[PDB]
Amino acid sequence: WGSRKIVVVGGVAGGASVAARLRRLSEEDEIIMVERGEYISFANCGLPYYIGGVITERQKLLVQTVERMSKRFNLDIRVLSEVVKINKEEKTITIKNVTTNETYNEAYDVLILSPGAKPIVPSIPGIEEAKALFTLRNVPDTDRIKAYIDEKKPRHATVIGGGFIGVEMVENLRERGIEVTLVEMANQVMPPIDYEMAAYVHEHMKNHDVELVFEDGVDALEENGAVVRLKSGSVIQTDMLILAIGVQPESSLAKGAGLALGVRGTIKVNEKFQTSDPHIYAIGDAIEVKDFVTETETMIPLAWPANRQGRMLADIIHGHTDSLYKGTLGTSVAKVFDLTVATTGLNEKILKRLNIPYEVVHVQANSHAGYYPNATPVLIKLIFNKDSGKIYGAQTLGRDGVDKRMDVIATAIKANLTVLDLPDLELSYAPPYSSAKDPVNMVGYAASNIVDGFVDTVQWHEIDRIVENGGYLIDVREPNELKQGMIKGSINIPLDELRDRLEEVPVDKDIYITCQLGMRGYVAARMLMEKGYKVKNVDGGFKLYGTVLPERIVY
Amino acid sequence: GSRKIVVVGGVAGGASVAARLRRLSEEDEIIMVERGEYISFANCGLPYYIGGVITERQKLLVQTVERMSKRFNLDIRVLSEVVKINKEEKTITIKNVTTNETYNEAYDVLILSPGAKPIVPSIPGIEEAKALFTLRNVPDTDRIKAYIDEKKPRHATVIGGGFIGVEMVENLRERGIEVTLVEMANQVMPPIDYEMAAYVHEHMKNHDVELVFEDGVDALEENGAVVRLKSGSVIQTDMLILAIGVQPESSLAKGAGLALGVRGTIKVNEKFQTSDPHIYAIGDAIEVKDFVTETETMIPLAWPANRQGRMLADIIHGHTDSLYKGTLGTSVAKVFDLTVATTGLNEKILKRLNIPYEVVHVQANSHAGYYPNATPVLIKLIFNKDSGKIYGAQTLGRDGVDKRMDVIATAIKANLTVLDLPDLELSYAPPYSSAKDPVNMVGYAASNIVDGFVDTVQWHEIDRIVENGGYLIDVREPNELKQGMIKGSINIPLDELRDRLEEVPVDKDIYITCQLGMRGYVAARMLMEKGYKVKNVDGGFKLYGTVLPERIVY
Ligand SMILES: Cc1cc2nc3c(=O)[nH]c(=O)nc-3n(C[C@H](O)[C@H](O)[C@H](O)COP(=O)(O)OP(=O)(O)OC[C@H]3O[C@@H](n4cnc5c(N)ncnc54)[C@H](O)[C@@H]3O)c2cc1C
Ligand SMILES: Cc1cc2nc3c(=O)[nH]c(=O)nc-3n(C[C@H](O)[C@H](O)[C@H](O)COP(=O)(O)OP(=O)(O)OC[C@H]3O[C@@H](n4cnc5c(N)ncnc54)[C@H](O)[C@@H]3O)c2cc1C
Ligand SMILES: CC(C)(COP(=O)(O)OP(=O)(O)OC[C@H]1O[C@@H](n2cnc3c(N)ncnc32)[C@H](O)[C@@H]1OP(=O)(O)O)[C@@H](O)C(=O)NCCC(=O)NCCS
Ligand SMILES: CC(C)(COP(=O)(O)OP(=O)(O)OC[C@H]1O[C@@H](n2cnc3c(N)ncnc32)[C@H](O)[C@@H]1OP(=O)(O)O)[C@@H](O)C(=O)NCCC(=O)NCCS
């Protein structure tokens, strides 16, 4: 290999990952990493936790220091240096030293853009004058929010936007003893998950005394941000505001160089991360990726992809192209007080948008064997193709064992496994860790029963209309469980008696079954089908139904 | 259409096949025959009940006879021992355990899931050993707990240091009983390798277990209270637990002239069929092929027994037969504050089969270190250097160990190679992982070997190498030298190395060590690009010093 001058724009997840591997591939290359801020490789993900006082040491947020990293990898690292323009036909960039105000041009043979994505700042009347309004991207943002809390002693905070990071901000503010209201324009927190899964999250947040405001938005900020006027007309009195309404790719250098853009103003790249200019590559939050499941062009600003992309790009630049980026799966996770919430692939909302036929299943199963202490429920939703078993996505929540189940399913998906394969994953079983069939196996079995046609099912959002239309709903729980409530129109025949009471099941009506979790409902469905009844199980049973439609519960 | 299916054994395999069979057919007559008082008991929880961790005896019974027979319309017969298969008449003979009276029962299809029984060695004095116990079922468990209550033993001896022996060690220790573990091998836990066991041994010693290796019991004296060891050492003890393995319960099959396999297992085809077309067999009792090399073996674990049962029910009354592709051998045990997990094959087995492999040891944190309470996860990955085929993996640490093993075991069964592991997009936020998960990290390290970016040596090679002309550079920061170094090491910290290149001999083979191995790899990359012949010491000083603590130099 012939040595070259490689310039990297941005010094965090994408930029630092590519620079480090680039050095490992060549001692001779000149590697320059240009970063507008003071810090390289900061823990962007750690910022909410430093604000919450969970991370107590500011310096812990520095994953690599400029000194250590430039020495270890012989990198010419230039912090407080802003790339102001790309000159692509000249093959130079224009850099401004922020401290000294000197500007200069820097020649490159290869240019790498990893400038990330900036917070979306809405044009809300009063926002300019809102003294205690904050966005969160970098370390200085973090210092500012923390200084304000430490010095001004806010008693109430408002969080605008209920995405994964909005939610983490909600938690960390509460942790500091600040009362919190969360404002969301959607009808749920956390866009990546579906409505009925969000319903559990909402419960857990409200149990920690978070006020949740849905289908509302900030119409105006009044009294210097101390007064929040909602679109609806309602008002929130507050001592500070955190804006977390999402991010937009930092593609201005690209636009300025006349480089091709992708969806939502991302920098467009080919399979090798190359932009429309042969000498300029781009990675990280700023680029368009294909989603792994459908290969649809999208933007998914996550750290694993940024790091994977930077690491792969280094190999690619050196001609090691046997492996190219397979797209982003969208595996993500958040701590929500006592809960873990995870997602991978696509939700129902995206799939409907894309006109893709799917089925879903909701299976609750214990984090580990129930005879062993401190087992806790893990709820897995699995979304899949009825004919092929192709997995479109999964969502999981629970107090423990959630990251594990998501990681297994995420692995299965990238390995091109179908729901029919999930029951055959030989996982680690001893009493503290799992059960003889892991929750992953279990969700695999439930989905396989649909694929194989052993059971037909209906959703929480279908059952009421079905009962109105003459559906005959049999609740197979024990009579005592009905005190928790029931679905309207239900008739109770406990599972264990059903075989002795088949004469009570009409042979002239379409039969619908619910239990508590769906498992006993499924057993009943199997029995009745075999007896030649047409029957469907209510997926997730009453437990799920009552969580998402509590106002419809009959007592 | 209809069939009379008779199932022998009412626990993991038997109850699994029986429950799925019913869900498939309401028409079949299904009989489940069990010699003990209980079905579906938690075999796995028994040590934890003995340890007072599972406080409630009743929790050990997963389903009752009456509830299960009702729910799935099953003819469940406890305290009934099948004594004979009559394959020509398609009948079995059943003996009432309480009365000793027998009767015959006809079958269309017979399913054997009889499990495995404890290996009981021929120890002089074992017949008089009042307080010697094996552990299989609930009566065994009640007897052990009763002995502990009535005699209040001060000290217990555990013979056999497999996953189960070790569980019993913990559970007895946590009761305040002193414990000596006696092991024929030079390590606890046969499924893991020696250098991995070294971490386990340290942890057990820190919890006051006496560990006795490469020793056995020559005699039991004073009614089991005096343990005569082969080394000459004598243990005074108040009870003994025998946990030296299990052997398949294949006497029914053997007695009916069915083909047998390795270790006396019931031999079966890919659909669990024995040499008789109307008798099937599953669970600990059967021979399986290991998933990785397809070698005939016996792997007595619950996930397999449960899976085989569900799959067999599908073979009989389900749709398109899925065939059993063998047992991977994924297992895990709690060892005090440690989790220890394994999957696939270890070095010892690979060496026995003469299969060429490489290994990597990567210690990475359970989650990002900038977030509180991150703890090390050590992953050993064993693989083929040419194809990148994964042969096996082992992992240990305090937290996040079961997760990493499950991802790797998923990857193996999905036929991924080490080259694919860096591309597994897993769940990352500060409490849960890092931007590159420990699994990605071990993939990268292994991929660098497969692709020739680094060459490496092992903990068990470096001393010999140094004795025979190798030049060893320790690239740790001087501060990290607190726990010592490998003999013959010369310290040039990584961050100084590039400036001090003149100090590196160009005509010698260079060996590099760090603490965990990462910075040693970085140094090796640098030196390779500068034209030196160099290898990294896999696992660095931390691994070396753990397994060879007596060789550490200060
Ligand atoms: C509060 C917060 C929490 C998060 N938590 C998680 C999480 O838990 N899990 C997860 O997967 N992801 C998380 N993310 C997202 C994650 O940080 C990003 O996906 C990742 O950092 C993307 O890397 P990148 O290199 O594309 O951009 P960045 O990491 O943002 O790096 C881009 C850098 O380029 C610099 N730059 C931009 N333009 C110029 C220029 N013209 N000249 C010089 N320098 C420039 C910027 O200053 C910036 O430092 C979180 C993000 C935030 C803000
Ligand atoms: C203490 C202990 C802890 C364990 N922990 C774990 C663990 O953590 N993880 C794991 O994966 N595995 C563990 N195992 C192993 C696990 O229990 C077995 O792999 C699993 O139970 C095998 O299922 P099986 O149906 O083949 O046998 P079993 O579950 O043993 O069922 C066989 C049953 O058949 C009955 N039977 C045998 N012969 C006859 C006959 N002639 N007539 C009538 N009945 C008969 C027996 O009484 C027995 O009840 C553990 C085992 C023990 C003993
Ligand atoms: C429990 C035991 C009797 C098996 O019985 P089982 O009825 O298959 O019980 P499981 O919970 O395993 O099966 C759950 C069934 O409900 C289904 N199910 C579970 N949750 C569901 C849900 N929410 N919605 C729809 N279906 C669901 C599964 O798909 C599965 O059905 P399938 O096999 O027909 O697909 C047996 O495994 C046993 O004895 N276990 C403990 C003993 C043991 O394993 N010992 C070894 C030492 S630990
Ligand atoms: C740290 C950072 C600079 C990456 O630098 P890096 O030098 O690649 O460091 P990593 O720890 O990722 O190193 C991985 C390398 O070490 C190797 N390695 C790790 N442990 C090893 C071991 N025990 N033995 C041998 N090799 C080992 C891997 O094989 C891999 O090598 P390769 O990439 O050459 O194949 C970058 O990830 C970063 O800046 N992160 C923080 C920013 C961020 O991610 N932000 C998003 C918000 S959280």
C-alpha distance from B53 to closest chain A C-alpha (Å): 7
| CA A224 to chain CA mean position, Å | 33
**With contacts defined as CB-CB under 8 Å, which chain B residues touch A420?**
322
As a whole number of angstroms, the distance between CA A140 and CA A137 comes to 8
Distances (CA, A) of B303 to A408, B20, B279, B381: 16, 16, 22, 22
CB contact (8 A) between residue B409 and residue A429: no
* Measured distance CA(A35)–CA(B465) in Å, rounded: 45
Pocket lining: A397 vs ligand 3, CB cutoff 6 Å: no
Q: Which atom of ligand 3 is nearest to the CA of A540?
A: 23
Query: Which chain A residues in 322-361 lie under 8 Å from chain B, judged by CB atoms?
Result: 323, 326, 328-329, 331-335, 340, 342, 344
Q: List, in sequence order, every residue forming a beta bridge with A76; answer none if it has no partner.
A: A32
Q: Which residues of A touch B451 (CB under 8 A)?
A: 320
Which residues from chain B sit within 8 angstroms of residue A452, using beta carbons? Answer: 318-319
Phi, psi (rounded to 5 degrees) for B99: -100, -25
Using DSSP's 3-state secondary structure scheme, residue A368 falls into coil
Following CA atoms B114, B119, B124, B130 in sequence, which dihedral angle do they give, to the nearest 10 degrees? -60
How far apart are alpha carbons A110 and A6 in whole angstroms? Answer: 5
Name which of B45, B339, B432 is nearest A333 (Cβ-Cβ). B432
User: Chain B 408-437, CB below 8 Å of chain A: which residues?
Assistant: 409-411, 413-416, 419-420, 422-433, 435-437
Q: How far apart are CA A206 and CA A196, in angstroms?
A: 16
For the CA of A449, the closest atom of ligand 3 is 35
Strand partners, B29: B4
Report the amino acid identity of residue A408: V
Residue of B17, B49, B410, B495 to mutate for A, most A C-beta atoms under 10 A = B410
CA distance A197 to A195: 6
Q: Which of A16, A29, A37, A45 is catalytic?
A: A45
Shortest distance between the Cα of B371 and any Cα of chain A, in A, equals 6
Report which secondary-structure segment, H or E, holds B69: helix B65-71
CA distance B340 to B262: 27
The domain locations on chain A are: 1-116+247-325, 117-246+326-453, 454-555
Q: What are the tokens at A83?
A: 């790339």
**C-alpha to C-alpha distance for A367 and A405, rounded to whole angstroms:** 9
- Judge whether A524 and A474 are in contact, CB under 8 Å: yes
DSSP state letters, B266-297 = BP--TTSB-SSTTEEE-GGGB-EEBTTT--EE
Taking the mean position of all CA atoms in its chain, how far away is CA A448?
26
| Residue B446 CB contacts under 8 Å (≥ 6 apart), including other chains | B358, B360, B381, B383, B388, B418, B421
Task: Give residue B526's identity as a one-letter amino acid code.
Answer: M
Q: Return d(Cα A160, Cα A170) in angstroms, integer.
A: 10
Classify burial at B101, counting beta carbons within 10 Å of its beta carbon; exposed 0-12, middle 13-18, buried 19 or more. exposed
Q: Where are the alpha helices (DSSP H) in B174-301?
A: 194-206, 251-255
Secondary structure class of A305 (helix, strand, coil) = helix
Cα separation of B382 and B412, whole Å?
A: 11
Q: How far is the CA of A320 from the centre of ligand 3 (A)?
A: 47
| Segment holding A167, helix H or strand E | helix A164-175
- Which ligand 1 atom lies nearest to the CA of residue A11? 33
Give dist(CA A490, CA A260) in Å, integer: 58
DSSP code string of B340-405 = EEEEE--HHHHHHTT---EEEEEEEESS-TTSTT--EEEEEEEE-TTT-BEEEEEEEESSSHHHHH
Q: What amino acid is encoded at A9 in this protein? A: V
Please answer yes or no on whether B426 and A331 come within 8 Å at the CB atom.
yes
In angstroms, the separation between the Cα of residue A355 and the nearest Cα of chain B is: 26
Domain B1-115+246-324 class, CATH top level: alpha beta
Rounded to the nearest 5 degrees, what angle is found at the Cα of A415, between the Cα atoms of A385 and A387? 15
Paired strand residues for B93:
B84, B104
Task: Quickly count: other Cβ atoms within 10 Å of residue A124's Cβ.
Answer: 19
What is the topology classification, in CATH, of domain B116-245+325-452? FAD/NAD(P)-binding domain (3.50.50)
B463-474 burial, b at 16+ Cβ within 10 Å, e below that, comes to bebbeeebbbbb
The CATH number of domain B453-554 is 3.40.250.10: yes
Count CA atoms closer than 13 A to B269's CA, side-chain side: 12
For residue B327, what is the DSSP state?
B
Q: Which ligand is nearest to the CA of A518?
A: 3
Fold of A454-555: Oxidized Rhodanese; domain 1 (3.40.250)
Distance CA A365, CA A378 (A): 5
* SS3 (DSSP) at A339: strand
Q: Do domains B1-115+246-324 and B453-554 have the same CATH topology?
A: no
SS (H, E, C) A435-493: CCCCHHHHHHHHHHHHHCCCCCEECCCCHHHHHHCCCEEEECCCHHHHHHCECCCCEEC
CA proximity to A537, closest of A469, A476, A448: A476
Report d(CA A460, CA A465) in Å as an integer.
10
**Tell me, what amino acid is at A514?**
T
CA A136 vs. chain centroid, Å, equals 18
Beta-carbon contacts of residue B69 (< 8 Å; ≥ 6 apart): B75, B76
Beta strands in A23-130 (DSSP E): 30-34, 76-78, 81-87, 92-97, 103-107, 110-113, 117-119
CATH code of domain A117-246+326-453: 3.50.50.60
CATH topology for A1-116+247-325? Answer: FAD/NAD(P)-binding domain (3.50.50)
CB A58 within 8 A of CB A46: no
Per the CB < 8 A criterion, the answer to whether B43 and B137 are in contact is: yes
**A201: enclosing H helix or E strand:** helix A195-206
Distances (CA, A) of B537 to A217, A420, A460, B91, B452: 58, 42, 57, 63, 15
Rounded to whole angstroms, how far apart are CA atoms A12 and A38? 11
d(CA A457, CA B212) in angstroms, rounded, equals: 58
Could you count the other beta carbons within 10 Å of the beta carbon of residue A509?
13
B237 closest CA partner among B251, B249, B250, B224: B224
What residues contact residue B467 under an 8 Å CB cut-off, 6+ apart?
A: none
Kindly provide the resolution of this structure in angstroms, with one decimal. 2.1
Q: Looking up tokens 């920690």, which residue turns up?
A: A208
Closest CA relative to residue A522, chosen from B208, B298, B71: B71
Contact A432, B434 (CB under 8 A): no
Picking from B500, B501, B548, the residue whose alpha carbon sits closest to that of residue B529 is B501
